[PDB]
Amino acid sequence: SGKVEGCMVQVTCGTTTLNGLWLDDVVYCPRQVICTSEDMLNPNYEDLLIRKSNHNFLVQAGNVQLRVIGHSMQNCVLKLKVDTANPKTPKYKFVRIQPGQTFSVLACYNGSPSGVYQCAMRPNFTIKGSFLNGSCGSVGFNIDYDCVSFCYMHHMELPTGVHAGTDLEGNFYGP
Missing domain, CATH: 2.40.10.10 (Trypsin-like serine proteases)
Structure with a gap:
C-alpha cells in the first residue's frame, strides 16, 4: 500500500464521488468531481468552481468527516484544505x-x-x-x-x- 493506505480518503461532490489522497491538511482529488455528467460534455471548470463553496465538498475519511475549510484549483487536480492533519502522513x-x-x-x-x-x-x-x-x-x-x-x-x-x-x-x- 506504500503505507498510503492510511492516507486513502474519499471526496464526494454533488452526486459524483471519487477517491482522494489525504496528505497533511491537504486533500487532492480529480477536478472532475465538480463536474456533472452534463457539464462533462463541455465543462468550464473555472465557472463551475466559482459557483461552488466549501460546503459543496464532502470529504470523508472512514467514518470521519473532514471539514473542508478552503478549496482551490491547481490545473486538473482540486486542492482542498481540511481542518485536520493526517496523523500518519508519510x-x-x-x-x-x-x-x-x-x-x-x-x-x-x-x-x-x-x-x-x-x-x-x-x-x-x-x-x-x-x-x-x-x-x-x-x-x-x-x-x-x-x-x-x-x-x-x-x-x-x-x-x-x-x-x-x-x-x-x-x-x-x-x-
Whole structure:
C-alpha cells in the first residue's frame, strides 16, 4: 500500500464521488468531481468552481468527516484544505515519471484499497488494468526507503479498456 493506505480518503461532490489522497491538511482529488455528467460534455471548470463553496465538498475519511475549510484549483487536480492533519502522513514528494518506469497503483474500490498492483505506463501514457476499473482518484507511487514518491492520479477510464491519468500536479501524461 506504500503505507498510503492510511492516507486513502474519499471526496464526494454533488452526486459524483471519487477517491482522494489525504496528505497533511491537504486533500487532492480529480477536478472532475465538480463536474456533472452534463457539464462533462463541455465543462468550464473555472465557472463551475466559482459557483461552488466549501460546503459543496464532502470529504470523508472512514467514518470521519473532514471539514473542508478552503478549496482551490491547481490545473486538473482540486486542492482542498481540511481542518485536520493526517496523523500518519508519510514522508512524500511529488515526481513526474516517464513510461517504462514501473510503479505501484493502490487500486481502490469504493474508497477501499483492495490490493496493490504494479502498473507501468505505455508509450502512449496509458495504463491497462481491469483492477483500475471502477476506480478513480487512485494514486500511483514508488517507494524509496521511507519516502513515497507519487507519480499518478487516475482521472478517467477510457472506453478502450485503458486508463488515463495525470501527475499529482494534475498535468496529464500524454495528450
